[PDB]
Design a protein around this ligand. Structure first.
Ligand SMILES: [Cl-]
Ligand SMILES: [Cl-]
Ligand SMILES: [Cl-]
Ligand SMILES: [Cl-]
Lengths: 298, 286, 286, 298
């Protein structure tokens, strides 16, 4: 039903998760960028990225909360929905440890699918803990994460992408990490999110062992190095994620404007650092609104 | 115990003038607080644009309310909220005021633009009659608490000139508006006349990229202005900065060149007041 | 794989007629499903009244959308949703259709009443011009998927009589409405003429306590009607029953007299399909 | 600022939690009824009840979900908000085990207060558990519940009422129950929700030991008997809760109407069982809307 030139060729109607699978296959590698809101998703789309990301940490911090697992399915879901309403670019969503036991995880998968989300990642961290527990990083046993994956796979559609994230590497080293990852794939993970993988020549071994597409997480200000997308792909990596990059720059920029207005009683010095009205109207595709009204009405 | 509305009333009286900055989310509200502003603002245009929509009145009470709630959950800094034309007739307006108060909001502004119109109407800026805006104000005043601040915004100046603008403003005050949002006054020497006539605290809107010039806080205050609003200033800079990071990552396959332009982890932990979390847990537990 | 809208289209074609019952929440939608209805309905008046508000158009897209989402999360039974007059101009209507589709809703109906009006306007029922409703329909059709069902509702009959009603209906179909909601046809012998002229499936609204009489499904179908709606039937009975329990507890200091009128734990566990939860856990784990 | 007749007397401005405290003090005992939505809250108010209740089980079941702790703070909070928008009658809200650790509990208290809720109850059940855990009832240790209470008390306002609920009685017997309850009061619970207390002559001992107002939960179809409000008060009980009574009757009534419409092709036989339009307009206080428009406009 879709055309190429004047030639009517087969095109399959593509669901969010299939668009994502397709973006992985067609890119080398797929760069996925963090976006904290619909407008950022549009900036990313306009720059020409083929997939976007909703960070768990970002959702919390944007609420003015620490990334301590205070947020729930609704906090993430509402931000996801806002983004998928604005763009069909496949969206990857951080759902932490699933927000509870088997049926919470099921509800999260279904709600994410109803929100037109393309993929989620779920982590093998310890969840909930005691009331007064101090912040930190603990892994669950492989079997506890297997159960989480099964709860998810049990209700997902075929197209929808479950990415199991492991933080084993920093704590248990490369061998034990590869072991979990393989167990996670066997339990039904579609892909793997390798967190904090240091030396790039460990990638080919990691990727070859796990078989499914692997995502490398390019964070800042942590204890992991920054390689290029090309380098990571040459070492067998299929996705590269930039989770918080843009929002760290948005923050510094907003702080700078606030300080200018405070210090100078006016924002004149900030004008050069601001997006122009015209770029804004363009990213919002404002003209298509006027054009739609002319197409249909008066 | 001071109510949100009272904190705001107090910030107007005690600052010369009160600078109110736009913040699009809780995190921005915290940055603003940390820089030391005494009042913050939730722009209606910002709510739409943040959702990836044009400022064409597509958004409803729930869209603004949800963003307001997220900001008041993070900070007690008095918040001023743009509720457009009120989102409907008298009972919608009533619902909006009550919901805003229940959200711990300190003030709202409502405008004298024409609302809804016909289905296929073209975008623009048209004023309602003075009597239609009076009705709007009465609906709002009827349910507001004493402390809560209703600010009537008029866009009359560009369309009807300074005389007719002062007339509306005064009618709006008489209908029960607490303060006045004077939109798009070009010459600063319009202000002293406007402010003197209107009597109640007046807010001047310092926007960028419009058809209005930029004066300083001091200049505006010396000309009788009590509040100065910076509605989108921070978010225009956030957008350029996000765009720059996106372009860098795309062009260079990595974000290295962007690192100098990013807030450090430590500044982030600080704005989030992260240590108070660890300290609270040590105070109460193990 | 059948889309919500297609399931609904299919239920219209294959039933004679399709009975669509009101449900105010997911639990009611499940009771309805269990009794074996093939399509369910979310009333706009029900959404308002459930919130403790009169049906005066105080509610917005978010109010109806949230209730819709809760019901579609629990059941795949095709859901018909009252979106009133569309909640604003062309882009609000567009947003409403898209949001309803993203909510897995199968159909909506939109009415040709006048919307918003002046701030202090008195409640009532006034029609928009045919051209204003055409514009509404075009805004909706422009963004809908093929399968999704737009039902134009007209209240013309009581105000303008059968002739002018058939005229609008036909104009609405030509503008792209998939089906027709004929509101307040008194005499059943109005139906065959109406239905024959309009051609597309027609819905008759079987309300209580109004100014319209009650015919049976069979009667309505024999007179050319394809859907019959029971918009508030269940919720009027729920209200009487809740009131009765409240009065009992108040008057007797205990709810003993109410016990015979309550659904048993076991019927509840059954409607919730509770066993499938235990069975799922045994299937997958320990 | 408030008047009695023509005599201007002192009246304190009363916060939701104070209204609740006051309703306890002034009634003997206070009957609190379950209401699943704003309209039900209004029916209750109209019948003249002085406090209303939002059941956790009710929130889930109304969503078409089992009471298995699938729901989160947002599910309860949204239903609470809908009710407090319609009525100032003090509302008691079930927040289960608090939906997470210390800061989730803090967020729940603050969000409940911002919603104009008067009181909440929190339970000493085990939370979250493993992914594939089977449904059931386990108590946490007294110390784990103490921690939960402290998280709550730490952020609550003075007026706001924390009610600690214990399910110890059915599992651990009267002695151990009184022990927890006393520990919970000392940790800062304002009142106590005694679940499943069988023999009424155990109440005076229970109430005398715990000191703070005690709530007896009048459920149906469980393993607990039904006494009258008067009987329970004479035995030292200060609140009596009717958590699901009205919604069990609403369900049977809606099922009956659906079956009638199915079986008869019309709802004629159901008409006698339906609230009249006029009672509806009245409970909605529809006339006050017309009167308000006449007061202010044309
Ligand atoms: Cl714009
Ligand atoms: Cl610097
Ligand atoms: Cl009504
Ligand atoms: Cl029976």
């Amino acid at each position: 039903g879709v055309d190429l030139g004047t030639e009517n060729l087969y095109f399959q109607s593509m669901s969010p998760g299939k668009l994502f699978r397709q973006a992985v296959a067609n890119e080398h590698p797929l760069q996925i960028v963090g976006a904290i809101n619909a407008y950022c998703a549009l900036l990313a789309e306009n720059v020409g990225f083929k997939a976007i990301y909703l960070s768990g940490g970002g959702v919390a911090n944007t609420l003015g909360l620490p990334d301590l697992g205070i947020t729930d399915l609704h906090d993430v879901l509402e931000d996801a929905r806002r983004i998928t309403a604005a763009t069909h670019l496949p969206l990857l969503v951080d759902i932490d440890t699933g927000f509870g036991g088997a049926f919470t995880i099921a509800r999260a998968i279904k709600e994410m699918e109803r929100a037109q989300v393309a993929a989620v990642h779920m982590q093998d961290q310890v969840a909930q803990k005691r009331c007064g527990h101090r912040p930190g990083k603990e892994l669950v046993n492989t079997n506890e994460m297997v159960d989480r994956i099964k709860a998810a796979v049990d209700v997902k559609s075929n197209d929808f992408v479950l990415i199991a994230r492991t933080d084993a590497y920093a704590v248990e080293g490369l061998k034990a990490t590869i072991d979990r990852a393989c167990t996670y794939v066997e339990a039904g993970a579609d892909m793997i999110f390798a967190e904090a993988l240091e030396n790039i020549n460990d990638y080919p071994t990691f990727c070859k062992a796990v078989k499914v597409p692997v995502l490398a997480n390019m964070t800042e200000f942590g204890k992991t190095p920054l390689y290029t997308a090309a380098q990571l792909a040459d070492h067998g990596v299929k996705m590269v994620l930039y989770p918080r990059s843009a929002d760290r720059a948005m923050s510094k920029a907003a702080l700078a404007v606030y300080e200018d207005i405070k210090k100078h009683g006016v924002q004149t010095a900030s004008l050069p650092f601001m997006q122009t009205r015209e770029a804004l109207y363009e990213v919002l595709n404002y003209h298509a609104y006027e054009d739609k009204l002319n197409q249909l009405f008066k």
